[PDB]
Short mmCIF file of C-alpha atoms and ligand atoms in Angstrom, two decimals:
data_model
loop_
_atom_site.label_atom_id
_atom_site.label_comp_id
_atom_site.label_asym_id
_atom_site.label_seq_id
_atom_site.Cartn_x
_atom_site.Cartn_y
_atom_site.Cartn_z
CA UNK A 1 0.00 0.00 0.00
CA UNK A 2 1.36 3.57 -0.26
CA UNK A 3 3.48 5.15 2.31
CA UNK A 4 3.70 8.98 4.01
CA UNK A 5 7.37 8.85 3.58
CA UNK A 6 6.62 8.29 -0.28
CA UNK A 7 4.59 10.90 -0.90
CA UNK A 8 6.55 13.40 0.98
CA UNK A 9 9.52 12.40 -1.62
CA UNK A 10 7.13 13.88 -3.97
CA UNK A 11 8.64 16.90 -3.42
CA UNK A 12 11.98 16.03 -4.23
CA UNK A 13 11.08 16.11 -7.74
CA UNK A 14 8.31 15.48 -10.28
CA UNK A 15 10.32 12.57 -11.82
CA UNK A 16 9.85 10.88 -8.40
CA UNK A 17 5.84 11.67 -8.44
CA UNK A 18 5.02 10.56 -12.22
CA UNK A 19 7.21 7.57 -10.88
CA UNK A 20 4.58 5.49 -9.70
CA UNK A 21 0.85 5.45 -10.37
CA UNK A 22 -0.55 6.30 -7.59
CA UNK A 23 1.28 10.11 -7.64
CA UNK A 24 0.21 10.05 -11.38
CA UNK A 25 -3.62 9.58 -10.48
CA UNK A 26 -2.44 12.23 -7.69
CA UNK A 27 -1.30 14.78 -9.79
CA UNK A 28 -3.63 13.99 -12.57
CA UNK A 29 -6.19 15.05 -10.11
CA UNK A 30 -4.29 18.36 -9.41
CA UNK A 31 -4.28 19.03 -12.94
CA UNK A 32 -7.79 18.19 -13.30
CA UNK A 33 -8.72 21.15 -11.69
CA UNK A 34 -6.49 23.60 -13.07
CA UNK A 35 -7.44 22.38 -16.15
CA UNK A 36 -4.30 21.22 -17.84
CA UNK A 37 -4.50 17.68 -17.40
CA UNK A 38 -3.66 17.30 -21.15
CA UNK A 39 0.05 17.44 -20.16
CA UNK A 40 0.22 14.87 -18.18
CA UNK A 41 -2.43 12.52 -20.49
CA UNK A 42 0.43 13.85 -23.63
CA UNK A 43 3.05 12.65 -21.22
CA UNK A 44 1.69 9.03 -20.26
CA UNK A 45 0.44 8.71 -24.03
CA UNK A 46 4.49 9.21 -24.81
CA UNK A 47 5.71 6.59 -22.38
CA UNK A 48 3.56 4.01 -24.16
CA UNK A 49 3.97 4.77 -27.30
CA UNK A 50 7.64 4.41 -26.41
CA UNK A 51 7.12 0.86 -24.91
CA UNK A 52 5.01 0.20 -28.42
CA UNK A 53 5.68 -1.76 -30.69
CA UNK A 54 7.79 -1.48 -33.96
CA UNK A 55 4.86 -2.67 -36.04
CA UNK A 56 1.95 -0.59 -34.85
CA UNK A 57 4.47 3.25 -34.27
CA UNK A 58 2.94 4.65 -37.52
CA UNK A 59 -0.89 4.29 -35.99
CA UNK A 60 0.05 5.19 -32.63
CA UNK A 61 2.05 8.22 -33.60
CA UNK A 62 -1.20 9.68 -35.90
CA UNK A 63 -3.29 8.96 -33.27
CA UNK A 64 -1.30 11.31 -30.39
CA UNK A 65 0.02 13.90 -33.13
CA UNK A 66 -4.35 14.11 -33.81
CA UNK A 67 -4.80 13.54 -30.23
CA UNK A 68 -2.52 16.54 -28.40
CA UNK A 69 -0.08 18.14 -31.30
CA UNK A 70 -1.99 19.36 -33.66
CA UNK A 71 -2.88 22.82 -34.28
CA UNK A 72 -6.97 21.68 -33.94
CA UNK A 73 -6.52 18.80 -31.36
CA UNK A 74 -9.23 18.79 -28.13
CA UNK A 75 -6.25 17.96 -25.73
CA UNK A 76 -4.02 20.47 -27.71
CA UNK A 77 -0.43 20.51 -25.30
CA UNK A 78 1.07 24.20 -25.11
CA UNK A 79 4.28 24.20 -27.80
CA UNK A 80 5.82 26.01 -29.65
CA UNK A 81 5.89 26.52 -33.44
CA UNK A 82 9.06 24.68 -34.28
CA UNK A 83 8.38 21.92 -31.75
CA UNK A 84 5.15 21.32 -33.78
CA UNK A 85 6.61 21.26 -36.74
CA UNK A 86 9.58 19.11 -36.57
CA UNK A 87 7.23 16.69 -34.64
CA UNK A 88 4.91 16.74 -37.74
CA UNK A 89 7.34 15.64 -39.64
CA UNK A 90 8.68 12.65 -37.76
CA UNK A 91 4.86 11.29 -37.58
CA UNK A 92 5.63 10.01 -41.56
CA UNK A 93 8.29 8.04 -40.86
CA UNK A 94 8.28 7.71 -36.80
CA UNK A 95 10.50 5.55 -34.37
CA UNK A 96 10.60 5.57 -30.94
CA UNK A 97 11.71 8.63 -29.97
CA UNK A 98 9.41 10.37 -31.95
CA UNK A 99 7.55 12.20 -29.22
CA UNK A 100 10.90 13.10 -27.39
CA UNK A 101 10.94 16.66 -28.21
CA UNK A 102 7.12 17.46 -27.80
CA UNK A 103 7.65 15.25 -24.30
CA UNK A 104 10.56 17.22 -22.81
CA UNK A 105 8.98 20.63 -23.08
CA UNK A 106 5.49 19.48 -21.78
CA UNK A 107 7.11 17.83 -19.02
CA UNK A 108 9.35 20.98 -18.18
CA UNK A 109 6.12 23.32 -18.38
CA UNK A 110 4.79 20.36 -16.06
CA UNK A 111 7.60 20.33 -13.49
CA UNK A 112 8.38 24.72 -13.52
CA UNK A 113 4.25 25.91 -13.53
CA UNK A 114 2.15 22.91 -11.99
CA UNK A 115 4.05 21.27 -9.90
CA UNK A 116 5.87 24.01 -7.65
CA UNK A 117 1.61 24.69 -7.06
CA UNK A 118 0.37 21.01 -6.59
CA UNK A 119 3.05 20.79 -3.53
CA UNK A 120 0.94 23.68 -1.54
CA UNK A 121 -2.49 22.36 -2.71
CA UNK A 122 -4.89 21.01 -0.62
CA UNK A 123 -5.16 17.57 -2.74
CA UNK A 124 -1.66 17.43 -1.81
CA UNK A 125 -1.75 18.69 1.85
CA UNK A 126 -4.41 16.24 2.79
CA UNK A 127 -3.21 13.44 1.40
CA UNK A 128 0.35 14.26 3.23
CA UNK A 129 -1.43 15.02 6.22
CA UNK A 130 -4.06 12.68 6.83
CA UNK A 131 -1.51 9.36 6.45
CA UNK A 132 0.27 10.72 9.94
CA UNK B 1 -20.04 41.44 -1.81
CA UNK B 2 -17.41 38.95 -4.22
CA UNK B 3 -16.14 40.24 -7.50
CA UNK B 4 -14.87 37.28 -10.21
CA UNK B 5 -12.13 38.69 -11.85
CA UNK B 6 -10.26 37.31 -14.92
CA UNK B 7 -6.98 38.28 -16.19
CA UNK B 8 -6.77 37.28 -19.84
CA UNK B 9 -4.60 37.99 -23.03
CA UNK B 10 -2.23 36.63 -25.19
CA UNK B 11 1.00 34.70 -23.81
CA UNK B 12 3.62 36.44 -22.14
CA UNK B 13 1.30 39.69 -22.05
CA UNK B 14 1.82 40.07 -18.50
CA UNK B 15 -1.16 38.70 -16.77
CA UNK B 16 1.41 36.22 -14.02
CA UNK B 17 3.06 39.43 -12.99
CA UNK B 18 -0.24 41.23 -12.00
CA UNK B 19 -1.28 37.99 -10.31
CA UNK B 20 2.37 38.38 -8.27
CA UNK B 21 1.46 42.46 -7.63
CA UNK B 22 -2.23 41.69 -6.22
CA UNK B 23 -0.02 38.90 -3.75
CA UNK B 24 2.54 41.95 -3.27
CA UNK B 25 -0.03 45.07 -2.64
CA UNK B 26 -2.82 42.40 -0.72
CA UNK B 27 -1.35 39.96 0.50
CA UNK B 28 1.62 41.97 2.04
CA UNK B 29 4.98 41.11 -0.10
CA UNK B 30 7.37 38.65 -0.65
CA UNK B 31 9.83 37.23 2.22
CA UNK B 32 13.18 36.40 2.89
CA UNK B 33 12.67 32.40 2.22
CA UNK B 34 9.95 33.16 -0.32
CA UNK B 35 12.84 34.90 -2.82
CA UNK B 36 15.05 32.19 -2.45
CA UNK B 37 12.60 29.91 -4.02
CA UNK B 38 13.09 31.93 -7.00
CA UNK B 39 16.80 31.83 -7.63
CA UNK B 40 16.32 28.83 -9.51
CA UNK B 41 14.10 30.27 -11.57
CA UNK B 42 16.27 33.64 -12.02
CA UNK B 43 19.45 31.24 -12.87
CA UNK B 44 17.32 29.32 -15.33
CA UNK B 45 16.08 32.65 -17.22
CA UNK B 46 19.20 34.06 -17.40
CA UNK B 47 20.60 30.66 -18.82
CA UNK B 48 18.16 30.17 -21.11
CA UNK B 49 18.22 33.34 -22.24
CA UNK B 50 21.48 33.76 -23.68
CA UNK B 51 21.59 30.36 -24.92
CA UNK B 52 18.24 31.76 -27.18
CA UNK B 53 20.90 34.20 -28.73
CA UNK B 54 23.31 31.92 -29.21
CA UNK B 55 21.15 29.61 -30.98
CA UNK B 56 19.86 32.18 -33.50
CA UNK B 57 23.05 33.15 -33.75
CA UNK B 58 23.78 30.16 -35.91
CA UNK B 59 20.62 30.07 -37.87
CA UNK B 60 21.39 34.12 -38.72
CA UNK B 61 24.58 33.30 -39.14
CA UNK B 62 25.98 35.97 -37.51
CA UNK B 63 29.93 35.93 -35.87
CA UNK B 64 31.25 36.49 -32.59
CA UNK B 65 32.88 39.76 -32.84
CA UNK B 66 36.08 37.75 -31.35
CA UNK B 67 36.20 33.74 -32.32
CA UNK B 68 37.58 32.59 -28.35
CA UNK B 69 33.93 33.17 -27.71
CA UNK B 70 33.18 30.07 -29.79
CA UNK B 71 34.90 28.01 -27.03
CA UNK B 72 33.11 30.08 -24.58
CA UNK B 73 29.76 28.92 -26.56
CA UNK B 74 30.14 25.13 -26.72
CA UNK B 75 31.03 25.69 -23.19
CA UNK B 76 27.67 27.29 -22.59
CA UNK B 77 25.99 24.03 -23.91
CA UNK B 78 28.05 21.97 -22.03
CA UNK B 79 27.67 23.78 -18.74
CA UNK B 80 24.04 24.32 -19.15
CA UNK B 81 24.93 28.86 -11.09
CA UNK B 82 29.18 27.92 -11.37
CA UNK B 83 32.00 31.23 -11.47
CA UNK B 84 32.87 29.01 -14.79
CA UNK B 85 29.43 29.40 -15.81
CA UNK B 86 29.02 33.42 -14.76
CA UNK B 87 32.31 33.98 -16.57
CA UNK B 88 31.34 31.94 -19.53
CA UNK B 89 27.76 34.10 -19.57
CA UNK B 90 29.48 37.84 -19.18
CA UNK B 91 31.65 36.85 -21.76
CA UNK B 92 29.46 35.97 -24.28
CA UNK B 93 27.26 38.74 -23.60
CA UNK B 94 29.90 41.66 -23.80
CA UNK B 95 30.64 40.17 -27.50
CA UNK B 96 29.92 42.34 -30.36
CA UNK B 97 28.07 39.92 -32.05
CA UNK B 98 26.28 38.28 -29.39
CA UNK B 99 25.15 42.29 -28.89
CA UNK B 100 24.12 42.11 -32.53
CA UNK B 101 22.42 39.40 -32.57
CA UNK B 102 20.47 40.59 -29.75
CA UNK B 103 19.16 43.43 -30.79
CA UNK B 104 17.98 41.25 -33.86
CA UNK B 105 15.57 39.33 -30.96
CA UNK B 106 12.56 39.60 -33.27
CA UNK B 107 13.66 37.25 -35.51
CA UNK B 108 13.74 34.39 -32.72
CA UNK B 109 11.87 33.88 -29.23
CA UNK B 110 13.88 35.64 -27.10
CA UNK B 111 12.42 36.70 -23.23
CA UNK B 112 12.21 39.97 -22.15
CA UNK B 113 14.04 39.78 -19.01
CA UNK B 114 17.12 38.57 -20.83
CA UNK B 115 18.37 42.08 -20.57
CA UNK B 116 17.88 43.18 -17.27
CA UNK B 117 18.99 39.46 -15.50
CA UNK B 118 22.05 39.83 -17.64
CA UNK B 119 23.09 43.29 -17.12
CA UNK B 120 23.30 42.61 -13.39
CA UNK B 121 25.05 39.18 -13.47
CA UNK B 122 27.60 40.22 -11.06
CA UNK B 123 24.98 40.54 -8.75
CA UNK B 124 22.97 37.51 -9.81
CA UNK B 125 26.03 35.62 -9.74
CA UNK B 126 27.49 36.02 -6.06
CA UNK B 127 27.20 32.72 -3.66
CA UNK B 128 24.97 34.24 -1.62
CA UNK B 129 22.58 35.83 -4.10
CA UNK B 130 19.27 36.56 -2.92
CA UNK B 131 16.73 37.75 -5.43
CA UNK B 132 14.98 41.34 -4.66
CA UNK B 133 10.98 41.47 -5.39
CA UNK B 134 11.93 42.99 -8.72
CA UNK B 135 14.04 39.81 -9.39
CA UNK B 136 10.72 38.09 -9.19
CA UNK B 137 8.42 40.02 -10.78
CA UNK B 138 10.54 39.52 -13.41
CA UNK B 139 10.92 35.64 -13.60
CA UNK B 140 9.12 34.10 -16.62
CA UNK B 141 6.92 31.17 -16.08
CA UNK B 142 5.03 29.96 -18.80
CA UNK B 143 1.44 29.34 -17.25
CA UNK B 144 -1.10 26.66 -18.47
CA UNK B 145 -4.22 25.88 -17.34
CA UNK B 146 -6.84 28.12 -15.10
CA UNK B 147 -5.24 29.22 -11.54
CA UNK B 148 -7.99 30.47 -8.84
CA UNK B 149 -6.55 33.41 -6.03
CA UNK B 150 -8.43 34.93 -3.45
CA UNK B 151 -8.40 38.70 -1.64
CA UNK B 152 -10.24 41.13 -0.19
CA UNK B 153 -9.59 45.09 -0.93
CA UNK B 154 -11.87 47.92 -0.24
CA UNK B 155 -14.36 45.54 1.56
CA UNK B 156 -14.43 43.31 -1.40
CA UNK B 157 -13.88 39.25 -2.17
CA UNK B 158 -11.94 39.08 -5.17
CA UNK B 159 -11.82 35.37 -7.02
CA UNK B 160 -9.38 36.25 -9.14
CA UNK B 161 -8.42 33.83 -12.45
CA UNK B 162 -5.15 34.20 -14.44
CA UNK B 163 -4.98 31.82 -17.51
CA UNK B 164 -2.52 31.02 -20.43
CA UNK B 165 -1.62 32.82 -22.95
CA UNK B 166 -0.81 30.78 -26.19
CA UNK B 167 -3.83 29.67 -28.59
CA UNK B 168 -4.19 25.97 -27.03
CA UNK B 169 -4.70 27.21 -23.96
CA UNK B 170 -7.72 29.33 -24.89
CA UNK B 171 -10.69 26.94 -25.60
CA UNK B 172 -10.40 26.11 -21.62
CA UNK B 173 -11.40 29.59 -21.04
CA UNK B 174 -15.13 29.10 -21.40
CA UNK B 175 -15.08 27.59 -17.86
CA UNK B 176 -13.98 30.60 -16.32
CA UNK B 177 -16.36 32.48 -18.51
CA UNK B 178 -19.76 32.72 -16.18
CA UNK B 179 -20.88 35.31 -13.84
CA UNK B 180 -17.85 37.47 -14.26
CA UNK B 181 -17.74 40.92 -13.39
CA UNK B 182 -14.25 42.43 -14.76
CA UNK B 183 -12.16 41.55 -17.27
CA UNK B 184 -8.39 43.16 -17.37
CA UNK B 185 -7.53 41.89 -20.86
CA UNK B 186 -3.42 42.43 -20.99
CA UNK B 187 -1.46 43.45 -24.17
CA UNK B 188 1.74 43.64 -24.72
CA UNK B 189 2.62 46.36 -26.29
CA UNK B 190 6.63 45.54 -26.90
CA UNK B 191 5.11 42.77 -28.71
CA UNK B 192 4.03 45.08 -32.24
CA UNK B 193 7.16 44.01 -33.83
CA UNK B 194 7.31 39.93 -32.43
CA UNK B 195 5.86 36.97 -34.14
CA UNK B 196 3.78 34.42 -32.34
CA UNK B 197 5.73 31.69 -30.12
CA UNK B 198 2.85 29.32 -31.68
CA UNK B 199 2.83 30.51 -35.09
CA UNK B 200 6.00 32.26 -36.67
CA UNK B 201 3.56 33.66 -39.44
CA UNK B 202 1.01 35.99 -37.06
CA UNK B 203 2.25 39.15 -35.36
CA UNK B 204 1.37 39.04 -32.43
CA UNK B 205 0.11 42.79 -31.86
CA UNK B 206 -2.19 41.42 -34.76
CA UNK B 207 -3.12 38.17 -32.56
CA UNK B 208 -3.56 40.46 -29.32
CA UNK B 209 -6.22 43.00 -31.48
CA UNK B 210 -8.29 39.56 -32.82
CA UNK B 211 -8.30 38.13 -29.45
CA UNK B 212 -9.35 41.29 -27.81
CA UNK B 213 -12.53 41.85 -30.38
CA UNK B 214 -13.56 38.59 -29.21
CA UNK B 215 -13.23 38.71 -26.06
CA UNK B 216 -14.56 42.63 -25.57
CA UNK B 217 -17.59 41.93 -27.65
CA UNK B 218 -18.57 38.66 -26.24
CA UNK B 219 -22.19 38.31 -24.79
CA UNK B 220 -21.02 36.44 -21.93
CA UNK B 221 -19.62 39.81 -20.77
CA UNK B 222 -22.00 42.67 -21.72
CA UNK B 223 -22.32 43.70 -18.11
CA UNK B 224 -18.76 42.86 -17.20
CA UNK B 225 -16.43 45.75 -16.52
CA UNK B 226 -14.21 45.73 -19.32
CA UNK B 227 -10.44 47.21 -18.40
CA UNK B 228 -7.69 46.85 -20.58
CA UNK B 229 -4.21 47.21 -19.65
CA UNK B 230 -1.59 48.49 -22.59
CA UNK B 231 1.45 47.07 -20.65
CA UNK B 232 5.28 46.57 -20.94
CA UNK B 233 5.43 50.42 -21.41
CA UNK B 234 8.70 50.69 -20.55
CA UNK B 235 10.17 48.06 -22.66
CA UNK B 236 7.93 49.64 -25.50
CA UNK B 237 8.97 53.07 -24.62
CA UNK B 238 12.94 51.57 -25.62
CA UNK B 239 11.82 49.99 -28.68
CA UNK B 240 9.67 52.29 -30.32
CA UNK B 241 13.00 54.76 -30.92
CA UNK B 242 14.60 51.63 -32.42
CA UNK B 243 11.91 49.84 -34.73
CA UNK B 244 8.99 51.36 -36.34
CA UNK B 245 5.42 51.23 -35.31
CA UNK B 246 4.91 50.41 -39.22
CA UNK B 247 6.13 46.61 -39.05
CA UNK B 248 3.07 46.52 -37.38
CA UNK B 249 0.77 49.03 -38.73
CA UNK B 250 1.60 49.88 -42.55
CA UNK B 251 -0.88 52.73 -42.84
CA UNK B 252 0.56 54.42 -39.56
CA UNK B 253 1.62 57.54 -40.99
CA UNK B 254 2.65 59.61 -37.42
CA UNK B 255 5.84 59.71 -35.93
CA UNK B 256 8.02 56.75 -34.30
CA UNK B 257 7.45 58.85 -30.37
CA UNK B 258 6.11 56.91 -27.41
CA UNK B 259 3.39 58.82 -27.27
CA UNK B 260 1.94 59.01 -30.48
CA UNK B 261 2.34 55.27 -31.04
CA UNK B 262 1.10 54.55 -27.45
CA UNK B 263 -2.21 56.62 -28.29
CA UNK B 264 -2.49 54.90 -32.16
CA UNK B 265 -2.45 51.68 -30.46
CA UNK B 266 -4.63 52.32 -27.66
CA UNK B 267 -7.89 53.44 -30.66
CA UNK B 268 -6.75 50.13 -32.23
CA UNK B 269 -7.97 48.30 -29.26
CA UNK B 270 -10.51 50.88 -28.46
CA UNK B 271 -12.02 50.92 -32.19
CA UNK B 272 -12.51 47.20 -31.73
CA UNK B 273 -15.47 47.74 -29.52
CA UNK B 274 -19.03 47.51 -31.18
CA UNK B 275 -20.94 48.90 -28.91
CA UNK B 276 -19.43 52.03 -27.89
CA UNK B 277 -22.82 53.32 -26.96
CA UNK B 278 -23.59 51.20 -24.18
CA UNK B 279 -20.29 50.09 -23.45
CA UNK B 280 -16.70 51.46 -22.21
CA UNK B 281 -13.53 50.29 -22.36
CA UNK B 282 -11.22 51.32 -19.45
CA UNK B 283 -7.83 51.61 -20.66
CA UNK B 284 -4.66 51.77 -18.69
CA UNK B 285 -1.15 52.16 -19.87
CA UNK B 286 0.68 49.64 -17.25
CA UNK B 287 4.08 48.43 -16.23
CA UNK B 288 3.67 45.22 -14.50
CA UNK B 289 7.27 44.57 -13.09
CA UNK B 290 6.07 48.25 -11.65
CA UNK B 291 4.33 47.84 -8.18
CA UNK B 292 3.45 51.38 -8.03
CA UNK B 293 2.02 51.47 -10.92
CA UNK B 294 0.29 48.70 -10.57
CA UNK B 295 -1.36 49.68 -7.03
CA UNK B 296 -2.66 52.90 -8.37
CA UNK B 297 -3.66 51.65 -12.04
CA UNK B 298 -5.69 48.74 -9.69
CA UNK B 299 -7.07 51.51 -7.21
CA UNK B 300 -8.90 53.02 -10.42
CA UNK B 301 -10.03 49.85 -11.74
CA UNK B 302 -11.29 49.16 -8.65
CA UNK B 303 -13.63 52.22 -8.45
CA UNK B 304 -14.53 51.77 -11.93
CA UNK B 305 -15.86 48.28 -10.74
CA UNK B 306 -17.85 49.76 -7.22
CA UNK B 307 -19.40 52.27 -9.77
CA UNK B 308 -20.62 49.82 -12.29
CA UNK B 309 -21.83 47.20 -9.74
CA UNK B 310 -23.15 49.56 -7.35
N1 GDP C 401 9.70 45.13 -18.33
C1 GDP C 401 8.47 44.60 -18.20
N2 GDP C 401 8.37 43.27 -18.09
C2 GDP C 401 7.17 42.66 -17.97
C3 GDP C 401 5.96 43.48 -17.94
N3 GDP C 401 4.93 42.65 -17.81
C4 GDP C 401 5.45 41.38 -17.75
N4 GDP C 401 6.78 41.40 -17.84
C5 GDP C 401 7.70 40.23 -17.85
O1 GDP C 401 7.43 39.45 -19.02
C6 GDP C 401 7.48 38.07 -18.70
C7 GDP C 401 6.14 37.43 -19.04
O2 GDP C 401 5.18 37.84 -18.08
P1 GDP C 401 3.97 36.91 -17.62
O3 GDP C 401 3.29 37.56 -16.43
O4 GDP C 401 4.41 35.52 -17.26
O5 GDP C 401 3.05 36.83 -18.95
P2 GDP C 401 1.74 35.87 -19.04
O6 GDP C 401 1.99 34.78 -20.07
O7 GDP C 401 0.65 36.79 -19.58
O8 GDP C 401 1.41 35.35 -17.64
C8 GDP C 401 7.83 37.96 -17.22
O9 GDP C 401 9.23 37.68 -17.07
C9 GDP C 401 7.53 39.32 -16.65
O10 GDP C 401 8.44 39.67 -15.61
C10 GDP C 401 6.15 44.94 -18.06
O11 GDP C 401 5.16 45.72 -18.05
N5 GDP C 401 7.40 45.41 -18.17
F1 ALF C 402 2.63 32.97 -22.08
AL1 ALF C 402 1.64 32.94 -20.59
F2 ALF C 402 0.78 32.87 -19.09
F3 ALF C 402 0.09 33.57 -21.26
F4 ALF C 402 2.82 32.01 -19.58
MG1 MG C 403 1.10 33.63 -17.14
#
């Protein structure tokens, strides 16, 4: 079951919260309500279309470029031009790093706007505080 | 006796930095251990920052003005706060072409505290640094989602929304959108010569004008209090000797002056309204890095929103 220690090493960084699933249900929660839980749905959608398979990439990568990249998508992440672009054009042809560059800056904007916020939220507070 | 406030405009307009004053001017200041929290940030500005103009720097093509700076670059990458690092940053930004290639920033996406945080690196620099308020208020954060704040001022409950900014963050703005009884729609007006982060083919005074006809004429807010704040003034007030108001505007046939420019663009925004006869736009030229500016441009607002709710 999950520990007070653990989620007070939530704060050490936001690698160590989207570490396990529990913090990413956590989190996803925080981001819920601020409504910008497409970053974090962009960022899990990433991770498995990393542990994806050679065979089915080409499908996979349409279906989060549609999903989150594109210009029109509903869950559309906040990048920039050139990030956009030069992840358009590795959805042709993609491998598995495809989503690296899109991932990196959505996980930055993650860990310097929402996450310094989710540690002094009440989500977070109670959770912390109720488990001593 | 609550007022729902939204602070809206395009990204980087300015609309985090009044959130910061109202937490400043209501909610008495930042401390000591609050600041230090921000050095991080500071460091990573500045860093960023001048790795922006080095970067362009090889898509302009432009050279160092001396080539030992090219070590000093790939050092930069490396690196990227150390006395290697600060040495490797003042270097790089007393070089001629570094220089040059700054003051070509609207050809690339370059922040607008790059200029100020690296200016006063010596200070930013020392061990024991401690950033001042203005160090923060100057920090950039890119925002996303909708943020809720709360405070009370003459007697009344503000819930107070700040929002992004850049074009995917804008269809979540419909559920902030009910019941809302001031808008202070921010502009940027440094940003008449800049392209859009999200699109390099849109100026984004051009964006700014589009999003602020929307917004202003909007039935969801014909009895909201409609303020608009015509900010980075200063930074404009630089920029307007050095590149003219025409990249912008073509037709503008007055004089590159702050003032002139400042008024053109204020009935720009003002013309966008269409219904000037039951409706009034309250502008304010702001500076939001400025606390006392902001406190008395937000003391008028204010009144302007007891008087219309009243
Ligand atoms: N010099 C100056 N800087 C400003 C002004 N308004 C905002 N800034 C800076 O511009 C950057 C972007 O501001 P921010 O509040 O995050 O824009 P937002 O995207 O609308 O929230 C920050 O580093 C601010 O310190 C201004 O009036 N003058
Ligand atoms: F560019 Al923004 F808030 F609108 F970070
Ligand atoms: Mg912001």
């Amino acid at each position: 079951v999950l520990s007070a220690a653990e989620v007070m090493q939530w704060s050490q960084s936001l690698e160590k919260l989207l570490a396990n699933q529990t913090g990413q249900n956590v989190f996803g929660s925080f981001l819920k309500s601020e409504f910008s839980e497409e970053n974090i749905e962009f960022w899990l959608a990433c991770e498995d279309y990393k542990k994806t398979e050679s065979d089915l990439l080409p499908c996979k990568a349409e279906e989060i470029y549609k999903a989150f990249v594109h210009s029109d998508a509903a869950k559309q992440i906040n990048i920039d031009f050139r990030t956009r672009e030069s992840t358009a054009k590795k959805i042709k042809a993609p491998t598995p790093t495809c989503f690296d560059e899109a991932q990196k800056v959505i996980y930055t904007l993650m860990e310097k706007d929402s996450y310094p916020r989710f540690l002094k939220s009440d989500i977070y507070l109670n959770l912390l505080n109720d488990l001593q | 006796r609550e007022v729902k406030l939204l602070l809206l405009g395009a990204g980087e307009s300015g609309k985090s930095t009044i959130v910061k004053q109202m937490k400043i001017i209501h909610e008495a200041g930042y401390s000591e251990e609050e600041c230090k929290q921000y050095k991080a940030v500071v460091y990573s500005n500045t860093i960023q920052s001048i790795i922006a103009i080095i970067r362009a720097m090889g898509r302009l093509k432009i050279d160092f003005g001396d080539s030992a700076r090219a070590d000093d670059a790939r050092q930069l990458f490396v690196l990227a706060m150390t006395a290697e690092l600060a040495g490797v940053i003042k270097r790089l930004w007393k070089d001629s072409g570094v220089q040059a290639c700054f003051n070509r920033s609207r050809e690339y996406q370059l922040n607008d505290s790059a200029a100020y945080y690296l200016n006063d690196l010596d200070r930013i620099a020392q061990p024991n640094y401690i950033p001042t308020q203005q160090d923060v208020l100057r920090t950039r954060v890119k925002t996303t989602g909708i943020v809720e704040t709360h405070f009370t001022f003459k007697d009344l409950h503000f819930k107070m929304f700040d929002v992004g900014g850049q074009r995917s963050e804008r269809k979540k703005w419909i559920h902030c959108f009910e019941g809302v009884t001031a808008i202070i729609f921010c502009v940027a007006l440094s940003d008449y010569d800049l392209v859009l982060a999200e699109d390099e083919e849109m100026n984004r005074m051009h964006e700014s004008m589009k999003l602020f006809d929307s917004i202003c004429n909007n039935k969801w807010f014909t009895d909201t209090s409609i303020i608009l704040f015509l900010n980075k003034k200063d930074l404009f007030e630089e920029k307007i000797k050095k590149s003219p108001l025409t990249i912008c505007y073509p037709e503008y046939a007055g004089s590159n002056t702050y003032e002139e420019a400042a008024a053109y663009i204020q009935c720009q925004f003002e013309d966008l309204n269409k219904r000037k006869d039951t409706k009034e736009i309250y502008t304010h030229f702001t500076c939001a890095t400025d606390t006392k500016n902001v406190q008395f441009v937000f003391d008028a607002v204010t009144d302007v929103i007891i008087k219309n709710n009243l």
